[PDB]
Ligand binder design. Structure first.
Ligand code: K
Ligand code: K
Ligand code: K
Ligand code: K
Ligand code: K
Ligand code: K
Ligand code: K
Ligand code: K
Ligand code: K
Ligand code: K
Ligand code: MG
Ligand code: MG
Length: 1333
RNA sequence: GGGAAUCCCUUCUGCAGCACCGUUUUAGAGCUAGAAAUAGCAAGUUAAAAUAAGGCUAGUCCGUUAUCAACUUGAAAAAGUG
DNA sequence: CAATACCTGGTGCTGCAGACGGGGTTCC
DNA sequence: CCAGGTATTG
């Protein structure tokens, strides 16, 4: 009675729970029932499962929040411009902005004339005739010298400001890198300057048309190279052109380089990458690569601007007008062609918005892509459509001006047109001259990402600090906003403090002191032996100093070969030396030292300790800030120390990331007796050579004492705060908090008696096609492969394992250097790099596509050495293209390092059994600290409750070994059953082997451990491979842990119990008010106004609102023309938008809806999934205010569940055991009819879907000659009809059963409402029939 | 067992700053023949404004995450109840 | 009222911090 | 993908 344990199964949508006794039995209690029914108590088994909707991330909320801010600020830009235009526009047209503001209104509601620009129909029609698009007006106002109407000037400037373009490019544009011809010519000039003996004849080469052509980068490269005889695309000039076109050329073979020189102008590394390449071949080639960069800028701009820039200063608007003119010409030609050749199709093409013709393209919902797909065969079917087809395949036919690709347009182009119009019209309007830079600033200004929202103490997201308390504008931003303090707070609010010194900021990752620390920390544990030496020796202080000065300060990376040859041979005169503590090359390195040595070119400055501070500060500025102007402002204090050239090169250098220790810990605090810092000991510590860990843990030093003193205790978090700050998915965090609440309630159930053990098991948890396609595109263009050209793929298709592996392997076998056939993927094998017997990893990271798995070698180990020798280079190419990860490459190449040792296999099995994920440890810590709170005489924790953590494989193997099978589709009982089995297995496992507590309980020979952990669960078995007692006891205590004659029967009876407390968490719905779609006007009271005065009957709006929670209303409503009061009882869905109004005053809200004399005390708040019971135990859940969900569980008996598992081949064993299971299936075939009858009785009692049940019965009687396996597999599908929750469709073979929905909630108003606690053991039942007259 | 620093990374959480579309109502004089029903043709590419209703704290801020059985108290926060 | 069937905001970019899981060097 | 809103049909 008093002693019990708890089993828990923590999932993303469920928390299973069970209470067990000494004999692994589940108790049952009488629980009091509250309410107004005649039932005063109820018998409950202490087993169940809480169900809840998934916890959501904050991402969608954040995207909507930032979009909201962007809409507000766009409006503010327009408002700034209008404030500038106010007075003079009032002189010209005192209602122009008023007409713009009310343009959306219907004429009935307009307070001014309905024509926006000019206020009369003649002028308006004339305007549209002269300027059919806004880009016509923009080009005119840029080119013309005449004084223009102020309203048209405003419209042009406002159109530029409202849709200003991206900010991906820093600086200014059109810096004479505009022409592709001239930059190509200059690239030829530079190349011919370096290679006089090998010049290129570029005469007659139309570089403009070739490089700006609308074709793939590689195709344009091929076109240009074809125009150059004796020049190949992978030559030097070909690689430069490929770099300008945006490809990833490898300049290695061009310059006979050893280090691969892959360059892409888009990658962040290029600025350093080039500097690396230029380090090997010299700086004579710098001019060449920079000329190629200029050419790249030219080609990128030629993508956007398709017009000659010498006829107009508005090339973008001119290109839009080109779109318009070609659209007009081609539409005229297409209309004439269709009239002549296909006159019957003309109406469908140009009049039917429902079809994807021109009518649906302009008036319907047809996109440019859909319109091209619809009209492609029509153009092919006709004659004279040759050039129209050319334009269609170029995606340049009948184009609009506002299109999806206009995202390419940089803001500098709109800025050029804006500045041009201002320059034209400031000659006539003085306020345009005085406010020119102001309007330009309105277009150009961005709030920096490091500043955040410009709040004033009412934003939990803001961090900006102001230099003065006044309104921030785009023009006073630098003066009002403290950009320095704001940018510093942006980082320091997120960065960790030193854990050893909690009040000390952490050093920058690339700090010189930090890398000195890391290098000395690694170097102090290096040992070496020679011949005459008796014992390996540490490196002395002088030796480490010499190694740093000779190797670490002359090479970016120091290898063990460099250590042996460049020091031990050159200095110590050793011909042979054995090194330990480092393999291949040192992990740490003085990278910042070499960066700054290249930049400032003063090694003595870098080595002088007096400059330490300065250098540190500099790196800090390069790490703390990312804006080059702010970096310049901060480095200005050291301008006197370096040349202007060095200062510029220093500006361009930037670092990211932070270390993990503070400067005060590394080189600040000093040991009391020695007076030496941590770094001082790392540089020299006699013959002990203590490292960081030893230094801060040595009781003979002051470091440990000072670290203990420096720790501070912050304000303790709450349970919810602690769980929220955990590192994990918000879904599993929701599960964790629910688990803790379940444990608290269970302890209260057991009379505040704490359990003996708590066994917890956390489920392994596994758009995305977009990320996969991004990976494959990047890796293939980085690879330089044409696999996407020769074989096109949709991102969705990549959800196929084998095809995704095909593209990740560039269509090649991973074990044989051969090509694979896409059409033969069904014949190929997917192989685990490390076998799944050892590592149960089914990720693409551990899988590989090969023709035959036989070719991997031996199945017991990692791929053989022969395969590695064959395929290592191909694997390295796949690695550098990110097509395979480093771990995948290392597992693939482990055979050359000995392959899998026996220790590796032992560790793999141990991993399969012992849980090591950090989040599970955090849950165990939470439970352990809540259960165990007292301390003993030695002030050590008293662990009354053992928190055991198990992995899912233990209970899964238990179920499969002792035929306690699970079928998830039958019902939700399997969560509770998993919890029960977790408790049983964990308690029994630690009872049998107490020494396992260290492995399995929270708190403080390889063949032998492999054998042991593989045979840890054999004590449950009676006979193993190739016998054991029926009673299993503990060896030392003699206590019984498992009775194989009685306890298995207990587990069976527990899993057979029909009454299981499955509780669906009732939740108030939150989030969006309704569907986002802005529907057109319609006569319906379902439409919701998008603005207070926008009557949806005239303006359209939203519908489909989400009900936050329903409310039971008992009141009277007026009836008929007489308004006679009639008593009612009904459900009112309070929408999310209505919730605040309803809660502020419920009576006023309800009376506004029409209810009179509302019984205030009878108002019942009913969230989603509110439980109601009707007749014959039939239950419903509240799906909404006008729909219900299935509220019952189908407790299918255990015999039928195990039969369904075995018959369907759900998941083997000995062939004799296989045939025993097959013979049992065939001997119990009648279980099929018995299961169908169980389902039918359940559906007639509870589901009440006459049509669906009859159709299912007909479908079952139709496929009775089908194989037993397939019939069982589809019986599994049938349980969707009876599953708890929302109805859904399901297929029995090819017969589709659509969901029967409960579109009415009238009945629950007279049924019994059931309020359940979190476990469901405590209930309050309210007979709703006793409400209302 | 647990933990630390470094290397190669890997995956995910949280935050800020932007762009392009979409949609919605209005504006872009449709014409001719019919009494009209309708028929024959012309035309189409653009813009304004909104983009959670809105809020007070009035900021170039905030408004979709997390958390929530019932009951007794409680203004609430919370505690308590089988 | 029951069956039925439709519908459902999307794309692209920049910058930053952190923990996580897992191979390796060294330690507590 | 779900699964609740909506209108159409009856
Ligand atoms: K009017
Ligand atoms: K050629
Ligand atoms: K369209
Ligand atoms: K190494
Ligand atoms: K930085
Ligand atoms: K100077
Ligand atoms: K919520
Ligand atoms: K939700
Ligand atoms: K509940
Ligand atoms: K590690
Ligand atoms: Mg707004
Ligand atoms: Mg638009």
């Amino acid at each position: 009675d008093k002693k019990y344990s708890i089993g828990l199964a923590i999932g993303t949508n469920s928390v299973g729970w069970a209470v067990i006794t000494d004999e692994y039995k589940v108790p049952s209690k009488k629980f009091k029932v509250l309410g107004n029914t005649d039932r005063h108590s109820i018998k409950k088994n202490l087993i169940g499962a809480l169900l809840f909707d998934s916890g959501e991330t904050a991402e969608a909320t954040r995207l909507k929040r930032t979009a909201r801010r962007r809409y507000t600020r766009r409006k503010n830009r327009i408002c700034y411009l209008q404030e500038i235009f106010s007075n003079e526009m009032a002189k010209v047209d005192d209602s122009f902005f008023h007409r713009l503001e009310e343009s959306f209104l219907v004429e009935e509601d307009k307070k001014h004339e309905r024509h926006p620009i000019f206020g009369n129909i003649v002028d308006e029609v004339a305007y549209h005739e002269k300027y059919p698009t806004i880009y016509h007006l923009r080009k005119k106002l840029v080119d013309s010298t005449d004084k223009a109407d102020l309203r048209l000037i405003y419209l042009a400037l406002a159109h530029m400001i409202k849709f200003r373009g991206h900010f991906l490019i820093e600086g200014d544009l059109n810096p004479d890198n505009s022409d592709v011809d001239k930059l190509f010519i200059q690239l030829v000039q530079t190349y011919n300057q370096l290679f006089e003996e090998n010049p290129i004849n570029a005469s007659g080469v139309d570089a403009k048309a070739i490089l700006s052509a609308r074709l793939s980068k590689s195709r344009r490269l091929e076109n240009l190279i074809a125009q150059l005889p004796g020049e190949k695309k992978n030559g030097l000039f070909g690689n430069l052109i490929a770099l300008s076109l945006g490809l990833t050329p490898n300049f290695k073979s061009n310059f006979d380089l050893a280090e691969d020189a892959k360059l892409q102008l888009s990658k962040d590394t290029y600025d350093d990458d080039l500097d690396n390449l230029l380090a090997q071949i010299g700086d004579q080639y710098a001019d060449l690569f920079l000329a190629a960069k200029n050419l790249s800028d030219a080609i990128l701009l030629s993508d956007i601007l398709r017009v000659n820039t010498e006829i107009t200063k508005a090339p973008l608007s001119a290109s839009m007008i080109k779109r318009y003119d070609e659209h007009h010409q081609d539409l005229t030609l297409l209309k004439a062609l269709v009239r002549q050749q296909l006159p019957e199709k003309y109406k469908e093409i140009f009049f039917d918005q429902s079809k994807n013709g021109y009518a649906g393209y302009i008036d319907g919902g047809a996109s440019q892509e859909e319109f091209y797909k619809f009209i492609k065969p029509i153009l092919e079917k006709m004659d004279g459509t040759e050039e129209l087809l050319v334009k269609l395949n170029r995606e340049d036919l009948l184009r609009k001006q506002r299109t999806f690709d206009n995202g390419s347009i940089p803001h500098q182009i709109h800025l050029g047109e804006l500045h041009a119009i201002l320059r034209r019209q400031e000659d006539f309007y003085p306020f345009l001259k005085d406010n020119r830079e102001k309007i330009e600033k309105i277009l150009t200004f961005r709030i920096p990402y490091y500043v955040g929202p410009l709040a004033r103490g009412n934003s939990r997201f803001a961090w900006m600090t102001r230099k003065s308390e006044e309104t921030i504008t785009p023009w006073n931003f630098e003066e009002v906003v403290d950009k320095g303090a704001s940018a510093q707070s942006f980082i320091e609010r997120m960065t960790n403090f030193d854990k050893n010194l909690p009040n000390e900021k952490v050093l920058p990752k690339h700090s010189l002191l930090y890398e000195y620390f890391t290098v000395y920390n690694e170097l102090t544990k290096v040992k070496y032996v020679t011949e005459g030496m008796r014992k390996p020796a540490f490196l002395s202080g002088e030796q480490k100093k010499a190694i740093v000065d000779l190797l670490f300060k002359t090479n970016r990376k120091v290898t063990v070969k460099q250590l042996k040859e460049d020091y031990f041979k050159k200095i110590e005169c050793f011909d042979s030396v054995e090194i330990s503590g480092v393999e291949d090359r040192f992990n740490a390195s003085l990278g910042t030292y070499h960066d700054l040595l290249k930049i400032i070119k003063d090694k003595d400055f870098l080595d002088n300790e007096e400059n330490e501070d300065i250098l540190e500060d500099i790196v800090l500025t390069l790490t703390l800030f990312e804006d080059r102007e702010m970096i310049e402002e901060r480095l200005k204090t050291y301008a006197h120390l370096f040349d202007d050239k060095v200062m510029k090169q220093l500006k361009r250098r930037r670092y990211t990331g932070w270390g993990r220790l503070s400067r005060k810990l590394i080189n600040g605090i000093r040991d009391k007796q020695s007076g030496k810092t941590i770094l001082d000991f790392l540089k020299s510590d006699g013959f002990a050579n203590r490292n960081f860990m030893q230094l801060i843990h040595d009781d003979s030093l002051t470091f440990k004492e000072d670290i203990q003193k420096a720790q501070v205790s912050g304000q303790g978090d709450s349970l919810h705060e602690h769980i929220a700050n955990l590192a994990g998915s918000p879904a599993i965090k929701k599960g964790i908090l629910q688990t803790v609440k379940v444990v608290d309630e269970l302890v209260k159930v057991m009379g505040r008696h704490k359990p003996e053990n708590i066994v917890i098991e956390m489920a392994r948890e596994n758009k995305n096609s977009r990320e996969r396609m991004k990976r494959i595109e990047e890796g293939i263009k980085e690879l330089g492969s044409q696999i996407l050209k020769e074989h096109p793929v949709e991102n969705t298709q990549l959800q196929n394992e084998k095809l995704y592996l095909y593209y990740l392997q560039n269509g090649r076998d991973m074990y044989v250097d051969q090509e694979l056939d896409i059409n033969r993927l069904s014949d190929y094998d997917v192989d685990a790099i490390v076998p799944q017997s050892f590592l149960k990893d089914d990720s693409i990271d551990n899988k590989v596509l090969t023709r035959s798995d036989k070719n991997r070698g031996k199945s017991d180990n990692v791929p053989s050495e022969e395969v590695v020798k064959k395929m290592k280079n191909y694997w390295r190419q796949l690695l550098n293209a990110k097509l395979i990860t480093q771990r995948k490459f290392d597992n693939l190449t482990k055979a050359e390092r000995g392959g899998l040792s026996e220790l590796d296999k032992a560790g793999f099995i141990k991993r399969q059994l012992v849980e090591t994920r950090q989040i599970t440890k955090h849950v165990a810590q939470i439970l352990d600290s809540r259960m165990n709170t007292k301390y003993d005489e030695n002030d050590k924790l008293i662990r009354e409750v053992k928190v055991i953590t198990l992995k899912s494989k233990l209970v899964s193997d238990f179920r499969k070994d002792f035929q306690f099978y699970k079928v998830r589709e039958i019902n939700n009982y399997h969560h509770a059953h998993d919890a029960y089995l977790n408790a049983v297995v964990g308690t029994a496992l630690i009872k049998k082997y107490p020494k396992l507590e260290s492995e399995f309980v929270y708190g403080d020979k390889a063949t032998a451990k492999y054998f042991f952990y593989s045979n840890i669960m054999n004590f449950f078995k009676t006979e193993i491979t190739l016998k054991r007692p029926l009673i299993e006891t503990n060896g030392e205590t003699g206590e019984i842990v498992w009775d194989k004659g009685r306890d298995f029967a207990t587990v069976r009876k527990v899993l057979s119990m029909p009454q299981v407390n499955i509780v669906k968490k009732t939740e108030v719905q939150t989030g969006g008010f309704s569907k986002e779609s802005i529907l057109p006007k319609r006569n319906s009271d379902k439409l919701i106004a998008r603005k207070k005065d926008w009557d949806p009957k005239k303006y359209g709006g939203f519908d489909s609102p989400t009900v936050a929670y329903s409310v039971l209303v008992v009141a009277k409503v007026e009836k008929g023309k007489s308004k006679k009061l009639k008593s009612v009882k009904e459900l009112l869905g309070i929408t999310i938008m209505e919730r605040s109004s309803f809660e502020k005053n419920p009576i006023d809200f309800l009376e506004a809806k029409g209810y009179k004399e509302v019984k205030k005390d009878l108002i019942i708040k009913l969230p989603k999934y509110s439980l109601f019971e009707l007749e014959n135990g039939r239950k419903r859940m509240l799906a909404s205010a006008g729909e219900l969900q299935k509220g019952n569980e189908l407790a299918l008996p255990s015999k039928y569940v195990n039969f369904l598992y075995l018959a369907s081949h759900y998941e083997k064993g000995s062939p004799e055991d296989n045939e025993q299971k097959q013979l049992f299936v065939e001997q119990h075939k009648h279980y099929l009819d018995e299961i169908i009858e169980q389902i039918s009785e359940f559906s007639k009692r509870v589901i009440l879907a006459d049509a669906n049940l009859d159709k299912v019965l007909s479908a079952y009687n139709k496929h009775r000659d089908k194989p037993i396996r397939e019939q069982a597999e589809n019986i599994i599908h049938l349980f969707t009809l009876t599953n708890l929750g929302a109805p859904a469709a399901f297929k029995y073979f090819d017969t589709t059963i659509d969901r029967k929905r409960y579109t009415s909630t009238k009945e629950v108003l007279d049924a019994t409402l059931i309020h359940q606690s979190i476990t469901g053991l405590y209930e309050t039942r309210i007979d709703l029939s006793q409400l209302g007259g």
